């Protein structure tokens, strides 16, 4: 039996907010990366450090620690790029037309063409951020969405996880009802948020596809952790 189910909606929210990883900085230097080498250099370094925080964040997600070590590994291997991206999209909300990878690393579409083969992915990230903006996505909602991504993305490849997912659904509704939304607005907004998760998955798939391409591996040396997270998606 898990403790996650016995939590209230407000308790679920507080736990997720308190588990939030910090916003990390990129390596400094006035840089202004205008080559895929330096650009990917900064991104992979940042991603590697974020991954360490994500792993410990996941352990504080209610219900996750109740899983076996193997199931925990699977879910993280499956969802890590999705989780990185929705975090990026979240940070970039108050910066339209720009992606805030780090407070000292704010990039526009022009710089996003330096990597290339992925400028569509850059545009998709911008589009998702703009979508969050117009929906006025709240922090309490964001941490629920990120939790859902962690538990759902590899839930197949079992009643426990689905029971926790239902709990987060109850939590999401609880937040909207607290915001004064009517019943129709509640299930409409719930749907709108969850459909974006399909787009999150798509960006991860396409994003992954480029990242574990042999050419992109050779651009800049990747960490052993980042490599093992990539190899988990090997085709």
């Amino acid at each position: 039996n898990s403790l996650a189910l016995s939590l209230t909606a407000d308790q679920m929210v507080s736990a997720l907010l308190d588990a939030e990883p910090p916003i990390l900085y990129s390596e400094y230097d006035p840089t202004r990366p205008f080559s895929e080498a330096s650009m990917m250099g900064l991104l992979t370094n940042l991603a590697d450090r974020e991954l360490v925080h994500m792993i410990n964040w996941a352990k504080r997600v209610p219900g996750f620690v109740d899983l076996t070590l193997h199931d925990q590994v699977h879910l993280l291997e499956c969802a890590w790029l999705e989780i990185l991206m929705i975090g990026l999209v979240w940070r970039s909300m108050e910066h339209p037309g720009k992606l805030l990878f780090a407070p000292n690393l704010l990039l526009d579409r022009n710089q996003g063409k330096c990597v290339e083969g992925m400028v569509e992915i850059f545009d998709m990230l911008l589009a998702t951020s703009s979508r969050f903006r117009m929906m006025n996505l709240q922090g309490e909602e964001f941490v629920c969405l990120k939790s859902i991504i962690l538990l759902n993305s590899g839930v197949y490849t079992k009643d426990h996880i689905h029971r926790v997912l239902d709990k987060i659904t109850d939590t999401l509704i609880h937040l909207m009802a607290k915001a004064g939304l009517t019943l129709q607005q509640q299930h409409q907004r719930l749907a709108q948020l969850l459909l974006i998760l399909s787009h999150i998955r798509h960006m991860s798939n396409k994003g992954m596809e480029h990242l574990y391409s042999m050419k992109c591996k050779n651009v800049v040396p990747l960490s052993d952790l980042l490599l093992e997270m990539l190899d988990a998606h090997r085709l």
């Binding site: 792993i55 070590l69 590994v73």
Partner: peptide, 10 residues
């Protein structure tokens, strides 16, 4: 063996 294996324990 995986790095993720180790990191999830500590």
């Amino acid at each position: 063996h995986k790095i993720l294996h180790r990191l999830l324990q500590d």
